[PDB]
Amino acid sequence: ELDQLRQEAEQLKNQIRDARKACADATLSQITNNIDPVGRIQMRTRRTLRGHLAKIYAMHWGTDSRLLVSASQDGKLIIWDSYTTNKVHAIPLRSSWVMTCAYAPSGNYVACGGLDNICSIYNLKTREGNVRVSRELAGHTGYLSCCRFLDDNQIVTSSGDTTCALWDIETGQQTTTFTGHTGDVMSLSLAPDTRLFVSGACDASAKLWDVREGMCRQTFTGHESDINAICFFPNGNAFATGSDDATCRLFDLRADQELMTYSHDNIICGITSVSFSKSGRLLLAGYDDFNCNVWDALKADRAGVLAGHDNRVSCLGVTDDGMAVATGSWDSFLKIWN
Amino acid sequence: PLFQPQDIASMVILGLTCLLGLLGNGLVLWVAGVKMKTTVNTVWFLHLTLADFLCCLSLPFSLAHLILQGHWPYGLFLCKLIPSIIILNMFASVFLLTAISLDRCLIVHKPIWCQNHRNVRTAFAICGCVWVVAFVMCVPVFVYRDLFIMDICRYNFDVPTPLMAITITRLVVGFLVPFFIMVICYSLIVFRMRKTNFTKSRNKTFRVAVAVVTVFFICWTPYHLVGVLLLITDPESSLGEAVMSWDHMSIALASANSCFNPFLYALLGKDFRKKARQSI
Amino acid sequence: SAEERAALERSKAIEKNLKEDGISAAKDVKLLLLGADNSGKSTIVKQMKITGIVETHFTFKNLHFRLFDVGGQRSERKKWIHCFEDVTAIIFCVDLSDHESLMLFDSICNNKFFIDTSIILFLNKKDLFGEKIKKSPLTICFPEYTGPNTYEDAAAYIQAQFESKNRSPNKEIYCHMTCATDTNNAQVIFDAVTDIIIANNLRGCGLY
Amino acid sequence: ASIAQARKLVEQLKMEANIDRIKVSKAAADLMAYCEAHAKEDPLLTPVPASENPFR
Amino acid sequence: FKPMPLXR
Amino acid sequence: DVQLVESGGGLVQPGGSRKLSCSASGFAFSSFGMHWVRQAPEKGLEWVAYISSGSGTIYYADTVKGRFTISRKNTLFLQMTSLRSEDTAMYYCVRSIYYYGSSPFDFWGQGTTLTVSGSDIVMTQATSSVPVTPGESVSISCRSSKSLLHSNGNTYLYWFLQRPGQSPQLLIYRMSNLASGVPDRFSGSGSGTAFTLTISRLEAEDVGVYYCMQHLEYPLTFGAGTKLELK
């Protein structure tokens, strides 16, 4: 019965390909040609937070757009006040090999994770003043690559065991687990309505998930290498994917295909982080060539260079109000641009 | 001729040295203190190039003084401060060279101790001690530099025995002790590296050691040699006139070490070479 | 500036504590464990005493070591191997009882992140290798080995095969043989680490 | 053996082959409309004056 | 006292 | 739980020397700024001393400076010299943390009793006593001699509640925010110079005396106090 199953799979793939090809009546490049270009976007460094001593792997903003949390490899998660460039907290970590961080939307908890296969939840509003480890989630076989906060009780994580899981920070059990990727998952983006999320794995494929039913909805392809970043459009109807093939690609949830390829023949270093602007007009992508490019999301054109890092940029993120852009590189310095 | 041949040579070498040293020291200090972080290895280069840059920036004061007479059309407190700063930066340079040699030998011979107790803070502490020693030995310059006659920045010696004492301490602590310490350290380094555990660095180490020591010798020997030569007997003899004439070339050779140091010391590491190439 | 002064004081205090902790941590020596499954990594990490990453620390002659074992990661190595760019050396262990490890050594030796870090080679199960040599020829693994069927020459050929994978002139590959019944592993690692420390410090200053 | 995996893959493809699609023209128009409506609320593509900028 | 050139 | 028990009072001859010590347990005392607040047998609260974390900055009141000294094992000491007749009060222990979004003056100790035989921002609580019935909304007013809206946009008015026979509790900090555990019925407002705390749906447990405090610059001068007596 293996032959029948293989034939059915091939037929289904052909049907999906034909259906997706029929709906491509026009492209974004043929539609947004008559809009005036954004011109030059010359941003200058506003602050330079020099606290760490080793590589920086992650950086996340709070909901108030003033506080940021950096999880460096020195085994320290320092919470940052951007306006005054002050250190507000210093949380030592049990495992120094950390490669993700998350700031709760309420602002009471901070998540962390890495090669310990375990997601750690720290409580920033303890009665005793200091910060304590509220919970230590276990259940992943491979390394935890990302973690995002749905709310104060549920946290969704992506790990290198080819599976993503939904957690309950109260009982510390996997309420729902997501399967289907054939390889390591190294990115994750929760939707603005916190009902959907998408993951980009190392098998060169992006998938759309439903948090409630726990079933895969759509599969996006088009990359020739591992996907290192993912991020939603502000409207939640589209998302951007950066890969190790030096290309950023834009997909549509409803149209279920690709829309634009953000590539330059001169660029060869991979992308480590993709993030948008508040209006969804710019797409700041972090390359390994020690600089971050600002792409025009509607015309596939460069609009400026955020040069200034001595090493590869490992994390990028914009504030909720869109008043600042953050870049964190291996040079142990985090920068605020405006 | 308006300028004697020795004076012409001294002036031209001073101008070339000032320009080249200003450029090199500025580049080295800028790159090391802006582009790169301050590790244990770069602290010594930073401080040595800072002393060299101060010396090269003070050099145009010597250029302006060495034109007509040198009656110092600049004041009294400046006449009391400029020579002190010049001597401070020169001797800080030589002392930091000696400290670099000591640190290299200590790294080679006792790796465990340097690995387990030597860091950036200790390097800063010992470098600050070196700077303090330089300031202390230049205190006599500050307390004696003055526009005494002023009718001429006379050196105060209120033949003077204090002049003998000053020259003796200058010669000893600035030439003899650093030279023996540096020679012993580099000789021990090469002797230990001739122990078959070092099959890819013996030639480079030998060349660098010989180059550094010979440059130091040919740059500083004329200075104290003439300093003690003109200090003995009445210079009324032809030898006295000769040494007085060579005094300008002597101070020129002493100053040129500031411009020679950066290429020989900081522009040796591959990382620093790449950083300097990128900055240019 | 009413209670912002106290915030500034707190920030300065915790910055000072960060600096002190960093200086305290910078003294330790970091090694990295690598090898095939059941190659003998567990034996030589247990003989020195004390599913994620397993970290083992011990002090030997005024040096604090940190052996980082990453054998539990059953995923792609290229997505986390850059975490250890600053390790002093790599301890690579080969089980002589058994070609499945030569490819891994080749991959790890020419890696862009490890172009300057030294590699330390330990070979285990000497008695087992001798018994297998008596029982079976050593040319089954390496068909091109035209030589005597003895332990002494087989070990030399194996060492040559593993050492020939180096291409960078600015690194060294120390070798050693083990019999699973000796305690000289600590001394071997200490000597190799002192040599590597001397080399790195000389290279940093430009005297190398 | 692999019959279960094949059945799971077939079912997943069948579920993913029946999502309703809209023409790419409408999607691009919607993205353009969203970008045009919120142009004035994006402080990154227009330099905010130093008075309003909190990082100045 | 003859004038002195700077340096020493 | 957090606990601040302290002792060192009694009856003291004038000019004698006493030592009050504050014992702390249940919280990271090494990272909190401890103050000293006293209450006369009839008058209101008056700030005494403050010692920063790490013994960096220490402040003393104008009527306290020179004679009294404070020092810090989880114990806070306050050396007391040249006791005068005006020093009779009940001395309290208060902790505080200062960072972005912090809640200063959150916890207050049980206090100890001691008996002895020009740029200050003066604050006035105009109403000495306010009679109010259960279930009816009230209002507590305060003022200041200088603007309390700093350039950074944070008003520094702290409201305190002193229940009858109990230590004061922090109810509203930064003139708009509500402290931890405080019921939602409380709400505070104001602008620039005049401030108001609105109590809606009065209960039996809310009866007491309410206080006004400033924090724009030391010394921290309190208000006279408004007595929200029953009925």
Coordinates of N, CA, C and O in Angstrom, one line a residue, chain F residues 143-216:
Chain F
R143 N -1.7 69.9 49.2 CA -1.1 71.0 48.4 C 0.4 70.9 48.5 O 1.0 70.0 49.1
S144 N 1.1 71.9 47.9 CA 2.5 71.9 48.0 C 3.0 73.4 47.7 O 2.3 74.1 47.0
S145 N 4.1 73.7 48.2 CA 4.7 75.1 48.0 C 5.4 75.2 46.7 O 5.7 76.3 46.3
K146 N 5.8 74.1 46.1 CA 6.5 74.1 44.8 C 5.9 73.0 43.9 O 5.3 72.0 44.4
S147 N 6.0 73.2 42.6 CA 5.5 72.2 41.6 C 6.2 70.9 41.8 O 7.4 70.8 41.9
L148 N 5.4 69.8 41.9 CA 5.9 68.4 42.0 C 5.9 67.6 40.7 O 6.1 66.4 40.8
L149 N 5.6 68.3 39.6 CA 5.7 67.6 38.3 C 7.1 67.9 37.7 O 7.4 68.9 37.2
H150 N 8.0 66.9 37.9 CA 9.3 67.0 37.4 C 9.4 67.1 35.9 O 8.4 66.8 35.2
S151 N 10.5 67.4 35.4 CA 10.7 67.5 33.9 C 10.5 66.2 33.3 O 10.1 66.1 32.1
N152 N 10.7 65.1 34.0 CA 10.5 63.7 33.4 C 9.0 63.3 33.4 O 8.7 62.3 32.8
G153 N 8.1 64.1 33.9 CA 6.7 63.8 33.9 C 6.2 63.0 35.0 O 5.0 62.5 34.9
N154 N 6.9 62.8 36.1 CA 6.4 62.0 37.2 C 6.1 62.9 38.4 O 7.0 63.6 38.9
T155 N 4.9 62.8 38.9 CA 4.5 63.5 40.1 C 4.9 62.6 41.3 O 4.7 61.4 41.2
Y156 N 5.4 63.2 42.3 CA 6.0 62.5 43.4 C 5.2 62.6 44.7 O 5.8 62.8 45.8
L157 N 3.9 62.6 44.6 CA 3.1 62.6 45.8 C 2.7 61.2 46.3 O 2.2 60.4 45.5
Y158 N 3.1 60.8 47.5 CA 2.8 59.5 48.1 C 1.8 59.7 49.2 O 1.9 60.5 50.0
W159 N 0.7 58.8 49.1 CA -0.4 58.8 50.1 C -0.2 57.7 51.0 O 0.1 56.5 50.6
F160 N -0.3 57.9 52.3 CA -0.2 56.9 53.3 C -1.5 56.8 54.1 O -2.2 57.8 54.3
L161 N -1.7 55.6 54.6 CA -2.9 55.3 55.5 C -2.4 54.8 56.8 O -1.7 53.8 56.8
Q162 N -2.8 55.4 57.9 CA -2.4 55.0 59.3 C -3.7 54.5 60.0 O -4.4 55.3 60.5
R163 N -4.0 53.2 59.9 CA -5.1 52.7 60.6 C -5.0 52.9 62.1 O -3.9 53.0 62.7
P164 N -6.2 53.0 62.8 CA -6.1 53.2 64.2 C -5.5 52.1 65.0 O -6.0 51.0 65.1
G165 N -4.3 52.4 65.6 CA -3.6 51.4 66.3 C -2.7 50.5 65.5 O -2.3 49.4 66.0
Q166 N -2.3 50.9 64.3 CA -1.5 50.0 63.5 C -0.5 50.9 62.7 O -0.6 52.1 62.6
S167 N 0.5 50.2 62.1 CA 1.6 50.9 61.4 C 1.0 51.4 60.1 O 0.1 50.9 59.5
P168 N 1.6 52.6 59.6 CA 1.1 53.1 58.3 C 1.3 52.1 57.1 O 2.3 51.3 57.2
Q169 N 0.5 52.2 56.1 CA 0.6 51.4 54.9 C 0.6 52.3 53.7 O 0.0 53.4 53.7
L170 N 1.3 51.9 52.7 CA 1.4 52.6 51.4 C 0.2 52.3 50.6 O 0.0 51.1 50.3
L171 N -0.6 53.3 50.2 CA -1.8 53.1 49.4 C -1.6 53.6 47.9 O -2.0 52.9 47.0
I172 N -1.0 54.8 47.7 CA -0.9 55.3 46.4 C 0.5 55.9 46.3 O 0.9 56.7 47.1
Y173 N 1.3 55.5 45.3 CA 2.6 56.0 45.0 C 2.7 56.7 43.7 O 1.9 56.3 42.7
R174 N 3.5 57.7 43.6 CA 3.7 58.5 42.3 C 2.4 59.2 41.9 O 2.2 59.5 40.8
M175 N 1.5 59.4 42.9 CA 0.3 60.3 42.8 C -0.7 59.8 41.8 O -1.8 60.3 41.6
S176 N -0.4 58.6 41.2 CA -1.4 58.0 40.3 C -1.5 56.5 40.4 O -2.5 55.9 40.1
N177 N -0.4 55.8 40.9 CA -0.4 54.4 40.9 C -0.8 53.8 42.2 O -0.7 54.4 43.3
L178 N -1.4 52.6 42.2 CA -2.0 51.9 43.4 C -1.0 50.8 43.9 O -0.5 50.0 43.1
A179 N -0.8 50.8 45.2 CA 0.2 49.9 45.7 C -0.3 48.5 45.7 O -1.5 48.2 45.4
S180 N 0.6 47.5 46.0 CA 0.2 46.1 46.0 C -0.7 45.8 47.1 O -0.5 46.2 48.3
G181 N -1.8 45.0 46.8 CA -2.7 44.6 47.8 C -3.8 45.6 48.2 O -4.8 45.3 48.8
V182 N -3.6 46.9 47.7 CA -4.6 47.9 48.0 C -5.9 47.6 47.2 O -5.8 47.3 46.0
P183 N -7.1 47.7 47.8 CA -8.3 47.5 47.1 C -8.5 48.6 46.0 O -8.1 49.7 46.2
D184 N -9.2 48.2 44.9 CA -9.3 49.0 43.8 C -10.2 50.3 44.0 O -10.2 51.2 43.2
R185 N -10.9 50.3 45.2 CA -11.8 51.4 45.4 C -11.0 52.8 45.5 O -11.5 53.8 45.2
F186 N -9.7 52.7 45.9 CA -8.9 53.9 46.1 C -8.4 54.4 44.7 O -8.1 53.6 43.8
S187 N -8.4 55.7 44.5 CA -7.9 56.3 43.3 C -7.4 57.7 43.7 O -8.1 58.5 44.3
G188 N -6.3 58.1 43.1 CA -5.7 59.4 43.4 C -5.4 60.1 42.1 O -5.0 59.5 41.1
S189 N -5.6 61.4 42.2 CA -5.4 62.3 41.1 C -4.8 63.6 41.5 O -4.4 63.7 42.7
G190 N -4.7 64.6 40.7 CA -4.1 65.9 41.0 C -3.3 66.3 39.8 O -3.2 65.6 38.8
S191 N -2.8 67.6 39.9 CA -2.1 68.2 38.8 C -1.2 69.3 39.4 O -1.7 70.3 39.9
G192 N 0.1 69.1 39.3 CA 1.0 70.2 39.5 C 1.2 70.6 41.0 O 2.3 70.4 41.6
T193 N 0.2 71.2 41.6 CA 0.3 71.7 43.0 C -0.8 71.1 43.9 O -0.6 70.9 45.1
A194 N -2.0 70.9 43.4 CA -3.1 70.3 44.2 C -3.4 68.9 43.8 O -3.3 68.5 42.6
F195 N -3.6 68.0 44.8 CA -3.8 66.6 44.7 C -5.0 66.2 45.5 O -5.4 66.8 46.4
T196 N -5.5 65.0 45.1 CA -6.8 64.5 45.7 C -6.8 63.0 45.6 O -6.6 62.4 44.5
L197 N -7.1 62.3 46.7 CA -7.3 60.9 46.7 C -8.8 60.6 46.9 O -9.3 61.0 47.9
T198 N -9.4 59.9 46.0 CA -10.8 59.7 46.0 C -11.1 58.3 46.6 O -10.6 57.3 46.0
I199 N -11.9 58.2 47.6 CA -12.3 56.9 48.2 C -13.8 56.7 47.9 O -14.6 57.4 48.4
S200 N -14.0 55.7 47.1 CA -15.4 55.3 46.7 C -15.8 54.0 47.4 O -15.0 53.1 47.5
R201 N -17.1 53.9 47.8 CA -17.6 52.8 48.5 C -16.8 52.5 49.8 O -16.1 51.5 49.9
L202 N -16.9 53.5 50.7 CA -16.2 53.4 52.0 C -16.7 52.2 52.7 O -17.9 51.8 52.7
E203 N -15.7 51.5 53.4 CA -16.0 50.4 54.2 C -15.6 50.7 55.7 O -15.1 51.8 56.0
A204 N -15.8 49.7 56.6 CA -15.4 50.0 58.0 C -13.9 50.0 58.2 O -13.4 50.7 59.0
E205 N -13.2 49.2 57.4 CA -11.7 49.1 57.6 C -11.0 50.2 57.0 O -9.8 50.4 57.3
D206 N -11.6 51.1 56.2 CA -10.9 52.3 55.7 C -10.9 53.5 56.6 O -10.3 54.5 56.2
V207 N -11.5 53.4 57.8 CA -11.5 54.5 58.7 C -10.1 54.6 59.3 O -9.5 53.6 59.8
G208 N -9.6 55.8 59.3 CA -8.3 56.1 59.9 C -7.8 57.5 59.5 O -8.7 58.4 59.2
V209 N -6.5 57.7 59.6 CA -5.9 59.0 59.2 C -5.0 58.9 58.0 O -4.2 58.0 57.9
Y210 N -5.2 59.8 57.0 CA -4.5 59.7 55.8 C -3.4 60.8 55.7 O -3.6 61.9 56.3
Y211 N -2.3 60.5 55.1 CA -1.1 61.4 55.1 C -0.7 61.7 53.7 O -0.9 60.9 52.7
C212 N 0.0 62.8 53.5 CA 0.6 63.3 52.3 C 2.1 63.4 52.4 O 2.5 64.0 53.4
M213 N 2.8 63.0 51.4 CA 4.3 63.0 51.5 C 4.8 63.4 50.1 O 4.2 63.1 49.1
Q214 N 5.9 64.2 50.1 CA 6.6 64.6 48.9 C 7.9 63.9 48.8 O 8.5 63.5 49.8
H215 N 8.4 63.7 47.6 CA 9.7 63.1 47.4 C 10.5 63.8 46.3 O 11.4 63.1 45.7
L216 N 10.3 65.0 46.0 CA 11.0 65.7 44.9 C 12.4 66.1 45.3 O 13.3 66.1 44.4

